[PDB]
Symmetry: D2
Subunit: 301 residues, 4 copies
């Protein structure tokens, strides 16, 4: 037997950081959950009880907090890159660091129409995430995402013209509810190292903002032929607006809202044009995925 | 043996309703989860296998949807009162209906600075709830609440002067983080029936808005001596602003954020005035409760 | 305004304890989650920022661990009674202690047919719980329970003869699935204090075992007329087997499994006697409750 | 822009099946949650609003239930293979089917020491899973797993000899608690199609049983040098016992239980040899992974 793959580290490391402007009194907070998993010449910890090669997971935890003390934690793409780079630079025998960060929302409160200097609300469980893979000799691979963005539109969604055979019972519709939880990921061009990441720092917040804006506006405005067709439009727009992205991925549940036929009760009409009351379905759900990149086809387009 | 208490019905009934203004095109959505439990002369279903006294839970479910089709679902205090009243009026042998409603947020999207006519975002997992107990011969008892309102302030919270004995290790502090999930409940004066509830309908949304506003502003502005002292101020203000409330209850976790001493590492200073990076604690948590009403003491105040 | 009710303390205190028999090598583990909330002359912490009356929640936490170090943690009824008694005895101004304990399962592993001396499996998320209310001058009120005991029977459940009117669509059935999550609570006679609790210590584990045994055997063997009828039989049996119990409460969801008509596809027969494949329903669910005590009726029985 | 990857289908499809032996009266139940995602010539549903290429997710759902009606649902490796094969055979333009199955435990109750013919208990939230990828022209790739197997040992775990530098605070230990949630995956040799899967059917249940047995016995008996060293022993044993497995993967959290120094209180000794009461830590947690295969090194072993 032999070790074909191995990584290890610390998961679920909750981290808060505050910035205090002593001049203005304005405080700003950041909260995340961090995972760091390391790879390298560690196989003998598994095969030979050789712990000398293990940077303790507790030490990885300490290092996350120290790194947060000594560096900005925003944008998370930068913080993850700094953190991952540290492990491959500090430890000769560690050759990859895999850093996942979930950023939690703390949005400044407005009180009597004025932004409060030190009070915040969790205005959504929507997350902003990164996955930063720092691989010695192969640079820094970053996937950025937003997730848990839950939306619904009450009309201007359709679904007809799908394949019909002996397994099909679904009625075509020209007017339905569409609701989903948006998970959208943009994959950056490979960066050669931390310097290149730093050189693009403003692009991280800007591209997250673009992705969120495009998602919301396209969802709201597209008279949707299908989840497939709508999500493709989102992805193509995001690619058009940031050339340093290589791909955009969406993963979207179709969270079904079923009509309720009430005509058995006093002839009540609650279907089609008269549909007002619906039954949200917890499960099952459609699940629709795609990864969109830029075309290289020059014939048969 | 004998039945000392019994209630039964349907829980976790998910309900959506849409309102469509055909003139303007503006659609408005409502989503809730409903529980209805009935009491009455039902003991023989338990003791004698006498199902004749059971209004099937499936029928209770049907009735929830029918009631939502035939009535407004807002404010939830009204919808719950209509629904509960139905069961005690329709069925001679049913003498109480207990209606719990959780209202889910669907906030209209703004797209390019304009409110969208039919697209919505779950802008928070904060809920607005009601508990409506319709008891034949004893009117309608309503508790209204907001829950899952998660907030944090980064300073202007203190905790000192608490009891110190041989069980005490906690250091006094004059500057800490305070974070909580607000569960706030206001208990209405007993209503004699559905007519009286209807007579007060505008007060329901108004008092929910007041409770939320007072909660947020007091949290943000109180230089807090303790969770106890801050929550009391919230409750007293809400009581002062709605005379048809009898009590206000708060239940508040103290979701601790611990300082991290890093002085063992290169003399890094991250405590007291230099505290920037903190460890959010998932558990344990303080839990602080009180119910505030109006005073009737005339001496020894 | 005035404080009508108040309690405060520490929730979600995770506690593990090990017992080691040094002679035999056998180790035994206990794990729980504890909440302690105190009441007393504490109103001025809310009204006057008077923290002198507050036993810090952190100190309550310390006290939970110290109490676990100095006392058995089993049965939980005893541990909770010791813990609650401590607070009302130690602090003159504290007049009630409310102790909730959730006990987590760590069942000893059998390895090659022999019980292992120090290895355990979480063999179920079923819990054993207590709620111990220690009230100065009014003794110790204990509710014991089992919860999260999830069961299913594939036949020998029926539901017919229920009320049928214009709200009813449910078909009568003489053969259905019944599945539930059992929450069963037995309420003890008031105890005068810790001595009386100690005097009954063996009864706690014995009555929990009885409740669990009766629940399982009655569920398995009753050709059930309804959830109502089956749960009543459980409760009456438990009352008959422990005279120091005053009431038994059950709260049971009816976790529905729906037949799936497949006759639209190649005439497949999957209903009634030919029903093999079912759709488990996550929501909604029936919810059936009752509290059973001993009868005092001497006429009209 | 162009579609680089796409798959879509139905997730969270809950399925129950009963088998009834009419001779003996013994009934046996199976419950799972199923996801099926399809790939193929479907890009135009995304790019051109061409729904003709979409087998509706609702139809995929219907097909899951029909397949369960017409075939055994056990072992899940077989059921998933049948289900995935159906989609690539039925639809010319569908070229892959990805079938994930989570199997839920329904263990037959013993009542008065005898197995009950139709009553079951959810004896653990441990799952048995499969991931079956049916790819036209490339056969059937199966990963089998067990997950959510939660275990603890109270001694015979150690962790010393790890790297120590300026980031290290963790004390070496020669006696600690070890607790984890076991996620173990065995990856089968590629199968050429459904016939080859059928030819190995008995191996599926047998290898799951082996994996579970090896996991439990190794956990219980290994005087563990680290999570790394223990998990490697598990994997190598499983590989040795089934030649049709290519790799075994473990993913194991180290769910920490911290000692509690109580020496500040009355000199109580609760560390080292006197450690009895511990604080289970919800987060953070170590996370340790490896994939083990068979060696092909012939020099420098
Ligand atoms: O937008 C949709 N896409 C699908 O692939 C699908 N399948 C289905 O049942 N409903 C829908 N809706
Ligand atoms: O505001 C607080 N109230 C308490 O009762 C308490 N107890 C504690 O440990 N911290 C705090 N903080
Ligand atoms: O056992 C049951 N009790 C009910 O009260 C009820 N109501 C219902 O719809 N199904 C059932 N089943
Ligand atoms: O078994 C362990 N492996 C590690 O890699 C590690 N790191 C750590 O902090 N504790 C442990 N324990």
């Amino acid at each position: 037997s032999a070790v074909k793959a191995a990584r290890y580290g610390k998961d679920n490391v909750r981290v808060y950081k505050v910035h205090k402007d002593e001049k203005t009194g304005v405080q700003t907070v950041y909260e995340m959950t961090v995972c760091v998993l390391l790879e390298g010449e560690i196989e003998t910890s598994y095969t030979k009880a050789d712990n000398s090669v293990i940077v303790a997971t507790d030490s990885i935890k300490n290092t996350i907090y120290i790194t947060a003390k000594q560096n900005p934690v925003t944008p998370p793409e930068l913080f993850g890159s700094i953190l991952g780079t540290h492990f491959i630079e500090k430890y000769n025998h560690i050759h990859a660091a895999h850093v996942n960060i979930v950023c939690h929302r703390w949005t400044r409160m407005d009180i009597d129409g004025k932004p409060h200097p030190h009070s915040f609300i969790r205005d959504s469980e929507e997350k902003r995430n990164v996955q930063v893979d720092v691989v010695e000799g192969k640079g820094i691979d970053i996937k950025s995402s937003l997730s848990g963005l839950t939306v619904l539109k009450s009309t201007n969604s359709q679904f007809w013209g799908f394949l019909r055979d002996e397994y099909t019972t679904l009625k075509e519709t020209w007017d339905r509810i569409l609701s989903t939880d948006v998970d959208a990921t943009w994959q950056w061009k490979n960066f050669s190292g931390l310097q290149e990441v730093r050189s693009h720092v403003p692009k991280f917040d800007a591209t997250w903002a673009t992705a969120r804006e495009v998602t919301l506006k396209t969802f709201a405005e597209d008279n949707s032929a299908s989840v497939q067709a709508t999500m493709y439009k989102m992805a193509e727009q995001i690619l058009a607006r940031q050339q340093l992205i290589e791909t955009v991925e969406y993963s979207l549940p179709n969270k079904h809202y079923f009509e309720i036929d009430l005509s058995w009760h006093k002839g009540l009409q609650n279907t089609g044009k008269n549909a007002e009351v619906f039954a949200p379905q917890s499960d099952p759900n459609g699940l629709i995925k795609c990864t969109v990149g830029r075309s290289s086809l020059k014939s048969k387009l």
